[PDB]
């Protein structure tokens, strides 16, 4: 982990990966997880889903890392292996179940190889292999090819949504004359009301608003599914932290790419329980084939029954390309 200052989360996983016979070099870490390459704060559990997906061709629902062997503990923007945190570790019982569906794997799990489930082979690591987990039933349609879209202005979408007091979380500002905007931006951006390291979330000190607009982009790489994976931690952090920045009856608009991966779908289920209605949009103001907006409307900080069934059908219609 040479010349990396914010990868404590990656260090927290080496003991968990060691239980499964996995040892990743700095190049493999960089290729699998974008946040490692860019040296940014992250979660070990999220990272471990990505590593597990790439190395075994199946996400964490396979249960490969579900044996509680090694703890990961979070304490004031810093991860270590103290006991009392969520525990992970290689689970032979979960491997044994996968050996029936995949006979070739037998006795080749814990040898630091990439279990390519597609072409039934066990090869060295490859950045292009195991992008989508074979075990996971994807909640909605994806697109075969990323394509830019010369679209409409986003102001069109935002001006339709009710709420005078707006919080804009964005790299750039919008023209909203009818709205009272408080613009929050990443560090080094000028012209904003506030600047924060957005890889550490949104501070509660910002106050409560009628409309919260999470407008952070995530570069495309490899596939639609991978763009959801790369965007997942922003949903977790910015979407979750927005819950303490909403007045009663307020709304949360989030630029995103769907919830194709396990992590993104969890976040959306947590958020969906606190709003009267939750909608997945694909309006004319998108910049690409893969983009979409989550509109969570009428916040009550409640806990209602919420399934992704309605947004699944919405996104099935939205994602055709």
| Alpha helix ranges (H) inside 108-160 | 155-160
Q: Which residues contact 162 (CB under 8 A, 6 or more apart)?
A: 210, 211, 251
Which lies closer to a second copy via its Cβ, residue 25 or residue 124?
A: 124
Can you tell me which of 40, 113, 224, 262 binds a second copy, judged by CB under 8 A? 224
CA angle, residues 148, 152, 157, in degrees to nearest 5:
120
Pairing of strands 165-170, 209-215: parallel
Closest approach of Cβ 194 to a second copy, in Å? Answer: 8
Touching a second copy, residues 288-307 (CB under 8 A): 288, 303, 305
Beta strands in the chain (DSSP E): 70-74, 79-80, 86-88, 114-116, 121-123, 165-170, 180-185, 194-195, 209-215, 246-256, 275-281, 292-299
117 scored as a contact of a second copy (CB under 8 A): yes
Q: d(Cα 202, Cα 302) in Å, to the nearest integer?
A: 21
Contact yes or no for 240/232 (Cβ under 8 A): no
Q: Would you call 165 a catalytic residue per the annotation?
A: no
Q: Would you call 146 a catalytic residue per the annotation?
A: no
310 scored as a contact of a second copy (CB under 8 A): no
Number of residues counted as binding a second copy (CB under 8 A): 87
Task: Point out which residues pair with 277 in neighbouring strands.
Answer: 297
Choice among 8, 116, 165, 269 that is catalytic: 8
Touching a second copy, residues 122-181 (CB under 8 A): 128-132, 134, 138, 141-145, 147-154, 171-173, 175, 180
Q: H/E element holding 162? A: none
192 scored as a contact of a second copy (CB under 8 A): yes
Which lies closer to a second copy via its Cβ, residue 40 or residue 223?
A: 223
Choice among 52, 78, 140, 217 that is catalytic: 78
Q: For a second copy, which stretch binds (CB under 8 A), given 10-18, 20-28, 34-42, 84-92?
A: 84-92
43 scored as a contact of a second copy (CB under 8 A): yes
Q: For a second copy, which stretch binds (CB under 8 A), given 4-12, 20-28, 29-37, 222-230?
A: 222-230
Query: Mask: binding to a second copy, 171-190, rule CB under 8 A, as x and -?
Result: xxx-x----x-x-----xxx
Can you tell me which of 2, 3, 5, 84 binds a second copy, judged by CB under 8 A? 84
Which lies closer to a second copy via its Cβ, residue 7 or residue 216?
A: 216
Which lies closer to a second copy via its Cβ, residue 113 or residue 224?
A: 224
Beta strands in 186-304 (DSSP E): 194-195, 209-215, 246-256, 275-281, 292-299
237 scored as a contact of a second copy (CB under 8 A): yes
265 scored as a contact of a second copy (CB under 8 A): no
Q: Which residues contact 72 (CB under 8 A, 6 or more apart)?
A: 12, 13, 16, 44, 45, 79, 81, 85, 86, 87, 88
Which lies closer to a second copy via its Cβ, residue 24 or residue 267?
A: 267
Q: d(Cα 73, Cα 92) in Å, to the nearest integer?
A: 24
First to last CA, the chain: 39
Q: d(Cα 45, Cα 72) in Å, to the nearest integer?
A: 9
Which lies closer to a second copy via its Cβ, residue 22 or residue 117?
A: 117
213 scored as a contact of a second copy (CB under 8 A): no
Give catalytic residues, as residue numbers.
Answer: 8, 78
């Amino acid at each position: 982990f040479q010349n990396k200052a914010n990868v404590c989360w990656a260090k927290s996983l080496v003991p968990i990966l060691e239980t499964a016979g996995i040892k990743l070099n700095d190049r493999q870490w960089s290729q699998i997880i974008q946040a490692f390459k860019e040296d940014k704060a992250y979660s070990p559990e999220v990272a471990l889903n990505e590593i597990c997906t790439r190395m075994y061709g199946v996400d964490l629902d396979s249960g490969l890392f579900s044996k509680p062997l090694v703890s990961v503990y979070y304490a004031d923007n810093h991860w270590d292996n103290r006991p009392g945190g969520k525990m992970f570790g290689f689970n032979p019982e979960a491997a044994s179940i996968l050996e029936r569906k995949y006979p070739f794997t037998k006795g080749k799990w814990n040898i630091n190889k990439q279990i390519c489930v597609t072409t039934r082979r066990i090869e060295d690591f490859n950045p292009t292999t195991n992008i989508i987990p074979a075990n996971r039933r994807l909640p909605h349609s994806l697109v075969a090819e990323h394509r830019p879209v010369k679209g409409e202005r986003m102001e069109w979408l935002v001006n339709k949504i009710n709420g005078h007091h707006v919080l804009l979380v964005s790299g750039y500002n919008l023209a909203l004359p009818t709205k009272r905007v408080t613009w929050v931006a990443p560090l080094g951006v000028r012209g904003a009301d506030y600047t924060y390291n957005l890889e550490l979330g949104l501070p509660a000190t910002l106050g409560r608003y009628d409309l919260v607009v999470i407008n952070i982009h995530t570069p495309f790489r490899i596939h639609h599914y991978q763009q959801c994976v790369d965007h997942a931690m922003k949903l977790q952090m910015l979407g979750g932290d927005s819950l303490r920045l909403l007045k009663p009856g307020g709304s949360l608009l989030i630029r995103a790419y769907g919830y194709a991966d396990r992590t993104s779908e969890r976040v959306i289920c947590v958020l969906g329980r606190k709003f009267r209605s939750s909608r997945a949009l694909k309006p004319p103001c998108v910049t690409s084939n893969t983009e979409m907006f989550f509109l969570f409307s009428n916040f009550d900080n409640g806990r209602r029954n919420f399934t992704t069934h309605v947004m699944n059908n919405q996104l099935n219609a939205a994602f055709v390309g």
